Each structure stands twice: as C-alpha cells, then as structure tokens.
C-alpha cells in the first residue's frame, strides 16, 4: 500500500550477490518472517561494520525462521567484491545474506528509502539505512529509516523481531526496553474471564491512581 504499518510488502525480482540468476523476494521469503535492510554504499565504513555484525547474527535470525535481505543501489560486481572486505572485517568465513542490486533506483523510489544527502561517485542518489520487518503474510509489521550518518543497533533488530513473533501468537504486548525472558503486558482489551485460557502463569496487577485495571504483567 503506502509502506506504512499493515501494508503488504510488494514482490520484486532483482539481481543479487552470490547468485547468478534472478532473485525473487516472494520465493525467498515463502512461509518466513523477513527483514529487508538497505545501506547507502558498498565500500564505506559504517555499512561494513553493520553487514559484518548481521553476518555474525545470521544463524540467530534463521533459527527464528526469519530471512535477512540486504539492499543497495550498487551493482552485483560491487556487492561480491565488497563481501570479501565484510568477511575480513567481521572474521566471517561464509557469506549467506542475499544483497539485492537496485542500480536503476526503481525499487528505492518505490519503497521511499532514499537518503537525504548520500550520493555515489556518478552523482546519483543512494538509499538510507532502512528496515522492514515482514510477517509470513507479507505484512509490514515495523519500519525504521536511519540516515547514512547513523549506524543501526543490531541488538535492537533481533529484539524487535522477538517481540513481533511473541505478540503475533499470544495476547500480550512488550513493554519499554523489553528483552526475551522479561515479563510482558497483558493486552488491555483481554477480560479477566479470558485470562486462564491463554496464560498458564499468574498475572501481576499493579493498582493505578485512576483505579483502571489495565496495568497487568505476565511472566510467560
């Protein structure tokens, strides 16, 4: 739709790193959660540190049935050469993340992920540091747009994914600064009668000055 929350992430076909043929998004992400992330330019320092980090974390995502898909306005030849730098910097011996090529900027213009300042050697614009968290139903669950100046928090990416997956199946919402294993919130619309069906463990109620009963925590 508008690539705002709840919209369907569109399918696309593109060239990608490590594969000789066409990369098709929907075939790659079928029955999986996916995180599509862009970066401004290959062979730049922040981009190298981010991709080296995500390459280390790859198994943490895959075990949660989540695919990682890279993306920049660079060529396939640039991606493959740059990968050797990412592997060297990150002490990686096996690169697995497909990095999509968008040399024409058609996808970057459609997704609305262009950077405010960043341009390549040819004077053409480049993408910012975007994130799209995509459900197995192709729905955009969460988005982030960081500028080229500001490297992302890779721990935050895994933390958001764990919250999205938990809240997808259970009637809970994760509080501020929540980490896996911490108590979460019972959704405010869940009535006291409905609690036992969904929760094995005891709910903790915190009394508020307003006397409303919404402040409820649960340890799953």
A 10 A CB-CB count for 187 gives 15
Judged by beta carbon, residue 30 or residue 116, the one nearer a copy of itself is 116
- CA neighbor of 37 nearest in space, from 71, 9, 5, 14: 71
The catalytic residue positions are: 47
CB of 189 to a copy of itself, least distance (A): 9
Judged by beta carbon, residue 23 or residue 83, the one nearer a copy of itself is 83
Judged by beta carbon, residue 28 or residue 119, the one nearer a copy of itself is 119
**Bridge partner list, 96:** none
Q: HEC profile for 59-128?
A: HHHHCCCEEEEEEECCCHHHHHHHHHHHHHHHCCCCCCCCEEECCCCHHHHHHCCEEEEEECCCCCEEEC
CB of 16 to a copy of itself, least distance (A): 20
CB of 22 to a copy of itself, least distance (A): 26
Distance between CA atoms of 220 and 10, rounded to whole angstroms? 34
Which residues would be at the binding site for a copy of itself (CB under 8 A)? 2, 4-6, 41, 43-46, 48-50, 52-53, 81-82, 84-85, 88-89, 112-117, 128, 139, 141-156, 159-160, 163-164, 167, 172-178, 185-186, 188, 206, 208-210, 212, 214-217
Judged by beta carbon, residue 15 or residue 129, the one nearer a copy of itself is 129
A 10 A CB-CB count for 28 gives 15
CB of 207 to a copy of itself, least distance (A): 9
């Amino acid at each position: 739709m508008g690539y705002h929350l709840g919209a369907t992430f569109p399918n696309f076909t593109a060239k990608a790193s490590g594969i000789d043929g066409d990369f098709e998004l929907y075939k790659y992400i079928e029955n999986s959660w996916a995180i599509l992330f862009s970066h401004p330019n290959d062979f730049t320092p922040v981009c190298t540190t981010e991709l080296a980090e995500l390459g280390k974390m790859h198994e943490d995502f895959l075990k949660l049935n989540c695919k990682l898909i890279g993306f920049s306005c660079n060529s396939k030849e640039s991606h493959d050469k740059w990968i050797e730098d990412i592997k060297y910097y990150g002490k990686l011996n096996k690169w697995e993340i497909p990095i999509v090529c968008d040399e024409s900027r058609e996808l970057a213009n459609k997704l609305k992920i262009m950077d405010e300042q960043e341009k390549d050697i040819t004077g053409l614009p480049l993408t910012c540091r975007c994130l799209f968290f995509i459900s197995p139903e192709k729905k955009i669950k969460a988005t982030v747009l960081y500028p080229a100046t500001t490297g992302r928090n890779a721990h935050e990416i895994l933390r958001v994914l764990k919250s999205l997956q938990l809240t997808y199946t259970t009637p809970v919402a994760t509080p501020v600064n929540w980490n896996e294993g911490d108590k979460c919130c019972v959704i405010p619309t869940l009535q006291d009668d409905e609690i036992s069906k969904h929760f094995k463990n005891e709910i903790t109620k915190v009394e508020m000055p307003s006397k409303k009963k919404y402040l409820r925590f649960v340890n799953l």
